[PDB]
Amino acid sequence: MVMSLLGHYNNFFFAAHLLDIAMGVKTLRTILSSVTHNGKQLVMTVGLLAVVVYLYTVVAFNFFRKFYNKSEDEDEPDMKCDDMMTCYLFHMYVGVRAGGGIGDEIEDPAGDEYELYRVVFDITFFFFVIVILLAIIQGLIIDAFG
Amino acid sequence: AESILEYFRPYLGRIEIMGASRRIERIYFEISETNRAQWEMPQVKESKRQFIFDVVNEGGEAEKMELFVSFCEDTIFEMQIAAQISETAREAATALAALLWAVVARAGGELEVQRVKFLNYLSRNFYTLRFLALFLAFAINFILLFYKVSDSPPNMVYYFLEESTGYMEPALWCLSLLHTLVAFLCIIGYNCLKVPLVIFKREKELARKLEFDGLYITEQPGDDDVKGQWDRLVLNTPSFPSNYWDKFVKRKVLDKHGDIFGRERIAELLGMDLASLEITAHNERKPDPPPGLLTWLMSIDVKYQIWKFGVIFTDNSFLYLGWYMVMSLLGHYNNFFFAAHLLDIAMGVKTLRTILSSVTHNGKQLVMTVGLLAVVVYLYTVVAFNFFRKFYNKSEDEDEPDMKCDDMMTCYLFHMYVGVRAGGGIGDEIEDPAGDEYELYRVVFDITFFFFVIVILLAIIQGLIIDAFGELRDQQEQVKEDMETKCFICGIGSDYFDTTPHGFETHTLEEHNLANYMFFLMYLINKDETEHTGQESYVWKMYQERCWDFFPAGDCFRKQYEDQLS
Numbered sequence: 001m002v003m004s005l006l007g008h009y010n011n012f013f014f015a016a017h018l019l020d021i022a023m024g025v026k027t028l029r030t031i032l033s034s035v036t037h038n039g040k041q042l043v044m045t046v047g048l049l050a051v052v053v054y055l056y057t058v059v060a061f062n063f064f065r066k067f068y069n070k071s072e073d074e075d076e077p078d079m080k081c082d083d084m085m086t087c088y089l090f091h092m093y094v095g096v097r098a099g100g101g102i103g104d105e106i107e108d109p110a111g112d113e114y115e116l117y118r119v120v121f122d123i124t125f126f127f128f129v130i131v132i133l134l135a136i137i138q139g140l141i142i143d144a145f146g
Numbered sequence: 147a148e149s150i151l152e153y154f155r156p157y158l159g160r161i162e163i164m165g166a167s168r169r170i171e172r173i174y175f176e177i178s179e180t181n182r183a184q185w186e187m188p189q190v191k192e193s194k195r196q197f198i199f200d201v202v203n204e205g206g207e208a209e210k211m212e213l214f215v216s217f218c219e220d221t222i223f224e225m226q227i228a229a230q231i232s233e234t235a236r237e238a239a240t241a242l243a244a245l246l247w248a249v250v251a252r253a254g255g256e257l258e259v260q261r262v263k264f265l266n267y268l269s270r271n272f273y274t275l276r277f278l279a280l281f282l283a284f285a286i287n288f289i290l291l292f293y294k295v296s297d298s299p300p301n302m303v304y305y306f307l308e309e310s311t312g313y314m315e316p317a318l319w320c321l322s323l324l325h326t327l328v329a330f331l332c333i334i335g336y337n338c339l340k341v342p343l344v345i346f347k348r349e350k351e352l353a354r355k356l357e358f359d360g361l362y363i364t365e366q367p368g369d370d371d372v373k374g375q376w377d378r379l380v381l382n383t384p385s386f387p388s389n390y391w392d393k394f395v396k397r398k399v400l401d402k403h404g405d406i407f408g409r410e411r412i413a414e415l416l417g418m419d420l421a422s423l424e425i426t427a428h429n430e431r432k433p434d435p436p437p438g439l440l441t442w443l444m445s446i447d448v449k450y451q452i453w454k455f456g457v458i459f460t461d462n463s464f465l466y467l468g469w470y471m472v473m474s475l476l477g478h479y480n481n482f483f484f485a486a487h488l489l490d491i492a493m494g495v496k497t498l499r500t501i502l503s504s505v506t507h508n509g510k511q512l513v514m515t516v517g518l519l520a521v522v523v524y525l526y527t528v529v530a531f532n533f534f535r536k537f538y539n540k541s542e543d544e545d546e547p548d549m550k551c552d553d554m555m556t557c558y559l560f561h562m563y564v565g566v567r568a569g570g571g572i573g574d575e576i577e578d579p580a581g582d583e584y585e586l587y588r589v590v591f592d593i594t595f596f597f598f599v600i601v602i603l604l605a606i607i608q609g610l611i612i613d614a615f616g617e618l619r620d621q622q623e624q625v626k627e628d629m630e631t632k633c634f635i636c637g638i639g640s641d642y643f644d645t646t647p648h649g650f651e652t653h654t655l656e657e658h659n660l661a662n663y664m665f666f667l668m669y670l671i672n673k674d675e676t677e678h679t680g681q682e683s684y685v686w687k688m689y690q691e692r693c694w695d696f697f698p699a700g701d702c703f704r705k706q707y708e709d710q711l712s
């Protein structure tokens with residue numbers, strides 16, 4: 001009722017009705033219920049992913065400052081390593097997505113210093129929050145529907 | 147007589163044993179109310195849960211009852227030990243952090259006496275100290291989330307830039323000072339509370355091994371286990387049974403094997419030399435030596451102290467707490483070392499401990515699979531090292547100082563670091579094979595590389611870790627459910643008891659209940675041997691002789707008397 005009434009506010013609020021109804025045929029209601037059926041462990045797993053990404057953020061904050069830049073010529077006003085908050089946001093928003101961890105969006109480690117101290121960082125980041133953690137999260141929701 | 151029966155319902159306790167008649171018999175006794183009151187303690191219930199999960203899951207049906215009786219013997223110990231208790235980004239960050247914390251809390255000479263008075267307070271409330279430690283770690287990390295680095299001091303300076311509010315800067319200092327103390331309190335509480343359990347367990351196990359076996363006198367020590375060797379340094383001490391009840395157990399071993407072997411050798415191996423003095427001590431009377439308080443108390447068994455310290459340090463929980471200590475201490479090195487605490491604690495809620503254990507649960511094949519992936523990538527590296535040199539370059543104009551094909555080491559590193567990741571094998575990061583030469587000799591290389599180390603090998607590795615977690619969940623579910631379809635004492639399930647309504651509740655609540663035996667074992671202790679009934683002494687004799695035939699194991703008063711009582 002209230003959304004239908006607010007629809008006459010000259011807006012698209014009518015676009016929020018289809019949903020509620022679309023979920024009338026069970027085979028979709030079960031899907032919608034699967035999200036919260038097993039959420040008590042889903043929230044813990046999400047928290048674990050968040051703390052692992054934060055751990056990597058603080059590891060790379062005071063060791064790999066000179067890599068996190070967006071490669072702008074003659075000036076680098078954008079550095080995602082100076083503040084802890086911006087670095088954490090950048091990791092949590094870019095590294096999780098992408099194919100492969102934060103090895104596709106930062107400078108090449110071809111430089112002599114810390115090369116072997118960052119190749120392992122990239123590999124373990126790709127191995128611990130992409131091929132296991134996201135796999136587990138996707139598995140939990142899909143398996144509950146089954 | 148309904149009223150008296152109802153009043154006396156929570157005291158009478160039924161058990162069922164068989165023996166000397168080859169038929170099931172009933173027993174009755176009185177359950178003291180203090181024991182029932184102390185039964186529902188926070189530690190006791192979780193210990194029972196852990197014990198039942200361990201017994202049902204780790205395989206049984208042969209030593210099950212022996213482990214049951216052993217658990218009873220151990221749990222009596224802390225039932226005793228319980229006696230000593232008498233008296234913008236910031237807007238988003240706060241909202242998200244509060245949600246995470248909320249769900250975690252939803253599932254998380256005469257002057258020396260005052261020292262003991264204050265120290266006994268820690269053992270009473272021990273879990274809350276750990277709760278406070280987790281809370282402090284959370285708060286200090288959330289404060290840490292506001293750091294910044296500048297090229298000049300306010301040579302890089304890690305100056306902490308707070309918000310417009312000038313507060314919360316010294317709060318970091320005070321919280322850092324407070325966290326170390328509230329973790330040291332946890333350490334002291336653990337050293338005061340839990341270590342008697344493990345010490346007593348080891349003492350009891352050694353006493354059982356010596357009494358009913360000659361592993362340290364007759365045949366040989368196993369000489370292959372650190373636990374089975376480090377204990378050789380305590381046999382000579384005069385105070386070996388420090389916490390076990392049998393404080394004169396040394397007599398039994400020499401009385402059982404001191405004749406078949408060298409009696410002097412036996413009486414010298416176990417310390418306690420000159421057994422004539424021990425024999426003649428109980429001849430005239432019991433003298434009372436004068437007290438030597440605070441004068442000769444320094445003289446203590448050095449060997450026993452060393453052995454106890456070894457048993458302490460070989461443990462895992464205490465080592466974990468000490469690791470927490472050392473990291474907290476190193477935190478005051480003006481660093482982020484406080485960021486390594488959240489973890490250890492975060493893994494407190496099981497549903498995460500199972501995930502953490504799944505990584506190493508099946509690692510014995512995981513390492514082999516990783517090695518196989520490494521050798522396959524190396525094989526492709528040596529295949530492409532002497533055939534496809536002119537492709538591996540980073541496309542720099544007018545000069546190519548960077549070639550990842552010249553050295554074998556650089557080529558292998560480049561493959562192992564780039565090709566595995568990426569979507570598709572090494573076909574997205576090197577030159578196009580459109581050139582006429584070797585085109586069909588490299589298209590197949592790219593395709594097979596994408597097919598053999600990406601869509602199979604990584605899939606297998608991801609499958610192994612994920613599936614193990616599923617197996618762990620299934621194991622926990624099965625250990626929860628199996629106990630709901632059997633009795634853990636009877637050798638039969640719920641199907642036969644379900645022929646009548648509430649049959650299983652009747653077979654589990656008033657008949658053998660897994661808790662009536664708990665009261666029975668310590669009720670036998672209180673009543674002197676002269677007052678034992680015609681059956682109490684019967685079971686007590688076997689219990690002292692370690693024969694578990696008196697458990698029913700197959701039928702409980704109903705299969706025997708089906709026709710007479712249906």
Ligand SMILES: Nc1ncnc2c1ncn2[C@@H]1O[C@H](COP(=O)(O)OP(=O)(O)OP(=O)(O)O)[C@@H](O)[C@H]1O
Pocket residue numbers: 191629630631632633634635654658659660
């Ligand atoms: N032989 C048995 N002894 C005890 N409980 C049994 C037995 N067989 C089945 N059960 C089931 O186990 C329940 C008690 O054991 P459980 O491990 O669940 O105890 P708990 O976790 O302390 O809590 P609660 O007693 O409320 O279930 C009984 O209520 C019954 O449903």
Ligand SMILES: [Ca+2]
Pocket residue numbers: 675676677678
């Ligand atoms: Ca008598």
